[PDB]
Amino acid sequence: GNAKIGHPAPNFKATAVMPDGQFKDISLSDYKGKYVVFFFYPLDFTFVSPTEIIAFSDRAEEFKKLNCQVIGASVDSHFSHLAWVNTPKKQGGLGPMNIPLVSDPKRTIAQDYGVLKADEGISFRGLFIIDDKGILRQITVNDLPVGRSVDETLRLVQAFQFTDKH
Amino acid sequence: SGNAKIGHPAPNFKATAVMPDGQFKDISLSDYKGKYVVFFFYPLDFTFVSPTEIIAFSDRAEEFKKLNCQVIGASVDSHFSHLAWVNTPKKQGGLGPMNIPLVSDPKRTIAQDYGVLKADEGISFRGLFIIDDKGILRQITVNDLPVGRSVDETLRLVQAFQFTDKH
């Protein structure tokens, strides 16, 4: 991949399903001036990913207070993302989202970030912290079975911002 | 760059370390087959954030022992530098006695194999890697220099990989 600490995070432009339930083409560069947490998950309609997605969405206000945009992504189509959003939570759906969910059907974004599981065409659980100047500050990659922690992500974002001002 | 890939064998190394008994010993990652390994880099000895991380992992080594997990720290400093830092009491800004080995990577080849060498400064980023008992890399963590790592989070991850290994 091209994700290197201290270098500009690779830009992307891709269709996302937005919090209002509509599709929009967004770019990482849209969020210059804010910190960004950009995380990949393997596939829609799975059982580890919804715990993570719902936690980041439920707690989006805590990232807002850190002037930090959270963006999720997977190789599944944006239509599949919306289908999972519209599935009732009591049946295993995501429910309404406070974060956008990017579609990476060409796998080029996952490749740019070095998190494509090449033998299976899906992303590992990659999470990237990008500062307000677009510079990559933190790389996290978990193998497929093991989820990430919103608490840890908030600790990291806040710590980078504090040390930025030092 | 680097050869650290999730789901592939973690890059082996053979290097001089300062062991918990305070003596030099050449160790290899493959020595620890059969155990989980947390392998972490820090930029260089005799600094300010790194000792807090090193001491935290050393102080809490028993919690990794209870998970059949070996913790190993590393930097590009010489093995004499590591020993001097250990021999400096914590009261005076040193590490004090350690419960974990500290690997010396003076040729920078281990940092390069793990993709954490910061070009031009000849130091490693704050890289941390979780390797299972088969030697397979399961987790990559890399922090830019100013921000340290969490022992709690590392234990959460080791526990979760061992949990999911059961199915």
Q: Collapsing DSSP states into helix, strand and coil, what is residue B159?
A: helix
Residue B1, in any domain of the structure:
no
> In the numeric block, which tokens belong to residue A64?
């807002």
Residue A42, in any domain of the structure:
yes
Residues 6 or more apart whose CB falls under 8 angstroms from that of B149 comprise: B40, B53, B126, B128, B141, B143
Residues from chain B that touch A155, judged by Cβ atoms under 8 A, are 150
Shortest Cα–Cα distance, A142 to chain B (Å) = 5
Among A7, A30, A3, A18, CA closest to A109: A3
Q: Do B142 and A117 touch (CB under 8 A)?
A: no
Q: Any idea what the Cα angle at residue B111 is, between residues B110 and B112, rounded to 5°?
A: 90
Q: Do A146 and B153 touch (CB under 8 A)?
A: no
Residues 6 or more apart whose CB falls under 8 angstroms from that of A111 comprise: A1
The residue among A142, A150, A153 with the most chain B CBs within 10 A of its CB, best to mutate, is: A142
**Backbone dihedral angles phi then psi of residue B103, each to the nearest 5 degrees:** -85, 140
The residue among B137, B153, B159 with the most chain A CBs within 10 A of its CB, best to mutate, is: B153
Q: How far apart are CA B28 and CA A112, in angstroms?
A: 32
Residue B116, in any domain of the structure:
yes
Q: How far apart are CA A70 and CA A41, in angstroms?
A: 13
Residue A43, in any domain of the structure:
yes
Split into its structural domains, chain A has a count of 1
Report the residue numbers after which chain A has a gap, meaning the C atom sits over 2.5 angstroms from the next written residue's N, or none: none
Q: Do B7 and A149 touch (CB under 8 A)?
A: no
Strand partners, A27: A13
- Please give the single-letter amino acid code of residue A144: L
Rounded to 10 degrees, what is the CA torsion of A76, A48, B8, A122? 0
Residues 6 or more apart whose CB falls under 8 angstroms from that of B56 comprise: B151
Shortest Cα–Cα distance, B114 to chain A (Å) = 13
> What CATH code is carried by the domain that includes residue A155?
3.40.30.10
Shortest Cα–Cα distance, A160 to chain B (Å) = 6
Residue A2, in any domain of the structure:
no
Q: What kind of experiment solved this structure?
A: X-ray
> What is the residue range of B32's domain?
8-166
> Helix, strand, coil shares of chain B as percentages rounded to 5?
30, 25, 45
Residue B3, in any domain of the structure:
no
* Resolution of the experimental model, in Å, one decimal: 1.8
Shortest Cα–Cα distance, B96 to chain A (Å) = 27
Task: Give the helix ranges, DSSP H, for A33-149.
Answer: 49-58, 60-65, 78-86, 108-112
Q: Do A146 and B140 touch (CB under 8 A)?
A: no
Cα–Cα distances in angstroms (integers) from residue A52 to residues A82, A135, A146, A149, B120, in the given order: 17, 24, 10, 8, 37
Residue A1, in any domain of the structure:
no
Residue whose token pair is 């059961």: B166
Q: Cβ(A126)–Cβ(A115) under 8 Å?
A: yes
Q: Do B160 and A166 touch (CB under 8 A)?
A: no
